[PDB]
Amino acid sequence: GSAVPFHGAHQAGIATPVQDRLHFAAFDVTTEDRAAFVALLKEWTAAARRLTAGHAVGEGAYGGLPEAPPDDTGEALGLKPSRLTLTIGFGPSLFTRFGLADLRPEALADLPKFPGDNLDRARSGGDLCVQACADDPQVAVHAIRNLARIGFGKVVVRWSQLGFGKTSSTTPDKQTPRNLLGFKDGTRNIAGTEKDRLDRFVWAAEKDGTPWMTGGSYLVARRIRMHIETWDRASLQEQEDVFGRDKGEGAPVGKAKERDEPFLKAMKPDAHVRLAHPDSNGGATLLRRGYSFTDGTDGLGRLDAGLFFLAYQRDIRTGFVPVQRNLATDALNEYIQHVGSAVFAVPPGVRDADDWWGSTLF
Amino acid sequence: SAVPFHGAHQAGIATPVQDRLHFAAFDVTTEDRAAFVALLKEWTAAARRLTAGHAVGEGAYGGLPEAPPDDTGEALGLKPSRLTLTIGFGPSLFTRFGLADLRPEALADLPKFPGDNLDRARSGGDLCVQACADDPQVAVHAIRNLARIGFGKVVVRWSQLGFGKTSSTTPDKQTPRNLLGFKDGTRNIAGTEKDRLDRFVWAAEKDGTPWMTGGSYLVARRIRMHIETWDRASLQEQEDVFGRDKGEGAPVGKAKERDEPFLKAMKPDAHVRLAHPDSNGGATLLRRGYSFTDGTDGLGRLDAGLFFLAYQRDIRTGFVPVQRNLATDALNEYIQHVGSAVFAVPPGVRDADDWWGSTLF
Ligand code: HEM
Ligand code: HEM
Numbered sequence A: 001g002s003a004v005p006f007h008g009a010h011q012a013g014i015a016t017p018v019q020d021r022l023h024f025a026a027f028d029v030t031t032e033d034r035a036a037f038v039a040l041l042k043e044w045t046a047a048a049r050r051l052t053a054g055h056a057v058g059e060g061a062y063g064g065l066p067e068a069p070p071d072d073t074g075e076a077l078g079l080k081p082s083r084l085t086l087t088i089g090f091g092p093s094l095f096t097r098f099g100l101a102d103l104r105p106e107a108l109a110d111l112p113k114f115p116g117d118n119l120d121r122a123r124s125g126g127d128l129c130v131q132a133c134a135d136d137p138q139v140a141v142h143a144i145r146n147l148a149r150i151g152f153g154k155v156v157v158r159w160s161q162l163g164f165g166k167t168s169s170t171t172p173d174k175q176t177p178r179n180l181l182g183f184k185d186g187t188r189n190i191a192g193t194e195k196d197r198l199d200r201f202v203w204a205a206e207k208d209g210t211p212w213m214t215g216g217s218y219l220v221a222r223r224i225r226m227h228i229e230t231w232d233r234a235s236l237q238e239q240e241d242v243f244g245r246d247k248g249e250g251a252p253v254g255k256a257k258e259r260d261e262p263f264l265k266a267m268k269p270d271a272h273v274r275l276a277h278p279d280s281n282g283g284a285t286l287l288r289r290g291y292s293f294t295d296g297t298d299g300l301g302r303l304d305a306g307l308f309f310l311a312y313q314r315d316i317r318t319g320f321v322p323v324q325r326n327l328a329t330d331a332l333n334e335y336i337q338h339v340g341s342a343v344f345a346v347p348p349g350v351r352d353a354d355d356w357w358g359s360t361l362f
Numbered sequence B: 001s002a003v004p005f006h007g008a009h010q011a012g013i014a015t016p017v018q019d020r021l022h023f024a025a026f027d028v029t030t031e032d033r034a035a036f037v038a039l040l041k042e043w044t045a046a047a048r049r050l051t052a053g054h055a056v057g058e059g060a061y062g063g064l065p066e067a068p069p070d071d072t073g074e075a076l077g078l079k080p081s082r083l084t085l086t087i088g089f090g091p092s093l094f095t096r097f098g099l100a101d102l103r104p105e106a107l108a109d110l111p112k113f114p115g116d117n118l119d120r121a122r123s124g125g126d127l128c129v130q131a132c133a134d135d136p137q138v139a140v141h142a143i144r145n146l147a148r149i150g151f152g153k154v155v156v157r158w159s160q161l162g163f164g165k166t167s168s169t170t171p172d173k174q175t176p177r178n179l180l181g182f183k184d185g186t187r188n189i190a191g192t193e194k195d196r197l198d199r200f201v202w203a204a205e206k207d208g209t210p211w212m213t214g215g216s217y218l219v220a221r222r223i224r225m226h227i228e229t230w231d232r233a234s235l236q237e238q239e240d241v242f243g244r245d246k247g248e249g250a251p252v253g254k255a256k257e258r259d260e261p262f263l264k265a266m267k268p269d270a271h272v273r274l275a276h277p278d279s280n281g282g283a284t285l286l287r288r289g290y291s292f293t294d295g296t297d298g299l300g301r302l303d304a305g306l307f308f309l310a311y312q313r314d315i316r317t318g319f320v321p322v323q324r325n326l327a328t329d330a331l332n333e334y335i336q337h338v339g340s341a342v343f344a345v346p347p348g349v350r351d352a353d354d355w356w357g358s359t360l361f
Helices: A034-050 A092-096 A137-150 A195-201 A230-234 A238-245 A272-276 A320-328 A332-335 B033-049 B090-096 B138-151 B194-200 B229-231 B233-243 B271-277 B319-328 B330-334
Strands: A021-029 A085-090 A129-134 A155-163 A217-226 A291-297 A301-313 A334-345 B019-027 B084-089 B127-133 B152-161 B216-225 B289-295 B302-312 B335-343
Touching: A021 A291, A021 A301, A021 B302, A034 A085, A034 A137, A034 B271, A085 B330, A092 B233, A129 A137, A129 A334, A137 A155, A137 B229, A137 B233, A137 B302, A155 A291, A155 B289, A238 A272, A238 B084, A291 B289, A301 A334, A301 B019, A320 A332, A332 A334, A332 B233, A334 B330, B033 B084, B033 B138, B033 B330, B090 B216, B127 B138, B127 B152, B127 B216, B127 B335, B138 B152, B229 B330, B233 B271, B233 B330, B330 B335
Parallel strands: none
Antiparallel strands: A021 A129, A021 A155, A085 A129, A085 A334, A217 A301, A217 A334, A291 A301, A291 B152, B019 B127, B019 B152, B084 B127, B084 B335, B152 B289, B216 B302, B216 B335, B289 B302
């Protein structure tokens, strides 16, 4: 129920331990006024300082002038901060505005078309995004709602996604959660304490060639539908072959414990873990931080389930792209379909109370 | 950590309200009464396992490599999480299996109400399963596996996820707030008031339908909120709408949330004044609904609201009169009912040999 510090060299919500709930919103910008947008970024930062500490935005949720609408919408009154983090990112489309063209990072690469892609253009892209994570879904929703409210007339929500439960882990000392296929998801990830691996694989560095991004990261979001009818009639051996780990313990095939190291030669050549593993991709490593979702029925008598996949990396060209290219023959492809996509540059952290989101860009 | 599954009544009505909801309505595809009774028996056996935190059937793993696992496995390593599973029968069920003359008169069709905008695809249903738990994954795993067990005899018609309080961080003494920012539940039937339950919630034998004794009747309404419009309303407009202040939730003119309201100090069309039993001939409801947020719609607005669930001894003397009295509710400016269903919720599963629906079939 505690708070996660908001200030830092990096934004919270990446190496932070993975909270139970997600509310992710992508915003489109609707103002041409650079100064207006900078003022928005500063107002948003002030709101975020309150929200992550469990305080109401502005003058609060009541006790103001009767004839005026309250500053804070109020549905989080009395709740703890609940480990709320708020992480902002900038989409490639943003750099066509406010004369930012020359400032677009090289590592903010557009993704190529991948085989099997069925991307819904409505639930894709976006000028910027805010990832709200908390252990309380009301806390996460209240944050997105109030950021959207403050930005009325300068940004509009393009699409959003709620994740009802995590399918990732940055804390290998706690239980690994399971995705909706029933497998543990997050065993071999980067941990928030492996400072060296975060510097190597996650945080942009000055020498990478975009100085304002130093201390930030790059995010890939992929909305992935799961064919659960198909999966649920597959044999247990089939399910375990697809991944290369057994379902119960989550151990690599042939080994006894979840965290024993995989021996890749023992897995099928098209097993997911075998193809995604750093050793199969020249060392490419990702920080996965995704969440499961279900959005009702599919109108055909079935539950509609999926995984909202989020990966942070130092450079999209050396993280997500090579691994996803190596997944072209993945046995998992039979059971999933990518239906939404977006990339964002996640700027460095807000260094102190006089700093603000995006200060190093603007 | 767990809630007993067996009892005179089904759990999940008078038992403590859990943090999360997964509500599913199903349509029946088989015409074979025997096949359906077999399914109800299999479902009950699975519900016994699920509510105790165990996998269904032979388990999620460790069986024949060439067989699909009995349980889909995404709840392995989780606790029971106070999971309750409550099943109900819709009016349309009674057109099958020769049951037409066993439909309770208290399971009334709802009239059309002013301002209804009901999505047919998210309304109705032959039966429902209300899955409540503190962990949303436990709830979803339950619905997912019951649907799989029933495949070929039932399909999912519509599904709704919801959330209330988060108990790890919030005291249970504390009234949760709905997404309009107001405390919600102050004057409600509590699970501890056994005589109020008997008077207002549980069906009695003399009520006219013996197989329903110890059951109850459920109304579900998916109520969208116009969030962005609400949020532009002055603080005084918001408080006038309900008849309670926003910070403390006290009735107008009083000091404490639990002060009994003075109805004449509220505006004539204030929500509490129109919903209160004194304005409806004593009609009193057990509310057990959940907030929802499904995402944002095509115009960028927040798809959010209250998945309203009311239990009552008779729909004709519970939900209908009160909802009727809300025709002029000042709240109507900010909400819209977009889904609706009613169900007969049968009595409880008495012991290890009983099953869901035994008194009806
Ligand atoms: C529904 C989609 C997916 C599911 C269900 C899934 C599931 C899994 C599972 C069960 C594991 C083994 C446990 C672990 O170490 O985390 C795993 C590992 C991994 N997955 Fe996926 N995955 C999905 C999509 C992806 C995608 C799209 C990528 C990258 C483009 C990816 C990259 C990885 C990586 C890098 C590992 C770690 C392998 C290692 O280093 O040992 N996964 N995934
Ligand atoms: C989004 C829709 C609705 C919202 C936000 C809402 C909210 C509230 C609030 C804030 C209260 C005062 C606190 C409390 O006693 O719980 C209340 C009371 C109540 N509401 Fe609603 N309500 C909604 C719809 C309905 C409907 C559809 C019904 C019945 C058909 C209903 C029946 C009642 C009743 C019976 C009370 C208790 C009044 C009393 O005895 O003091 N509500 N509601």
